[PDB]
Design a protein around this nucleic acid. Sequence first.
DNA 1: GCGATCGC
DNA 2: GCGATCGC
Lengths: 177, 177
Amino acid sequence: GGGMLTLIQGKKIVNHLRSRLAFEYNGQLIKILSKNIVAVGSLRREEKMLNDVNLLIIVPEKKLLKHVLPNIRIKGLSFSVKVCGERKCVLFIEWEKKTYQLDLFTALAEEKPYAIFHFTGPVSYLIRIRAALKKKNYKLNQYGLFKNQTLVPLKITTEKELIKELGFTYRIPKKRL
Amino acid sequence: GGGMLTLIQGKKIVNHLRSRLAFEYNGQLIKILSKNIVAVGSLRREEKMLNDVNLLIIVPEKKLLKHVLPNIRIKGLSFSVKVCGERKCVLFIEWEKKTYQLDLFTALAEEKPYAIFHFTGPVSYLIRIRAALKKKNYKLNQYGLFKNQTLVPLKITTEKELIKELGFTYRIPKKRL
DNA sequence: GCGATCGC
DNA sequence: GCGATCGC
Ligand SMILES: [Mn+2]
Ligand SMILES: [Mn+2]
């Protein structure tokens, strides 16, 4: 049971974790770089109160997926692993005498803008936008845009470019509903 | 996680739990009856070693589903709730200095033989038999037999009757795959 | 709406 | 094979 947090506390936790994440790769500790850690979920949406903390980790190679989350390490911080696979890992962390939920997710570099778009939410916004695309025989997820189960090769790198390419109005995370 | 245990230890735990399960229903403690508790999973299949304990609880009315697992009580036993809803609840219990996983599932009375058939497994057996039924435009699950998304009203009460009615060879749980 | 990880 | 719970 993870406790509720203020936005401020959430950001403090992210900043702390940003330089302390690593994973064991066949007996070798590999540091995750700050530039490959993206705060997502309600924190990215700037919500005053948070039910947990959510981080998206950008993994440079498909081969590393079997190693990153299943061998996650956080320097100095007390935590326990509840459910964990290659794409989603739920941790319960200790922060200043209180327990909080920390969700970790992984995206490959080529999935990044789709992952950020997905994990930013909110859920109601995703459902709406995915419903509209579904009516045109598209399927959008955290990995790509598909039509008839085939990847649509969009020439984009950022979340804003993706949203514009999908034909939707760009709004900052704070203002997506 | 939960420790492994022998078939003997599993059966001892089931026998203990059999008279100690209850749930709170709007402030009132309602005992679950032994006759409405069925050991399922690898234990029912008589496997020498078990990764956890699995119980199916038969609930007499649809209205009670929102109350049974979300308010489960076990007299005298130390436990913690991991994930939990109306149909599946995972507990970690303390048994003689060791922690074990206890999975609880619910079936309505009219679902019973379908639930027992499903939760008995093994997984490979279910996939095979469901693949064969799917080719004839049926869908089998823990709730019933369906054709064209409509319940096939089979006149059965037991698991053995169901298997016979589906046209498959009845084998004891020990000998299914 | 869609997918991850889990249940058998 | 099919579904539950939980991620956004
Ligand atoms: Mn989360
Ligand atoms: Mn189990």
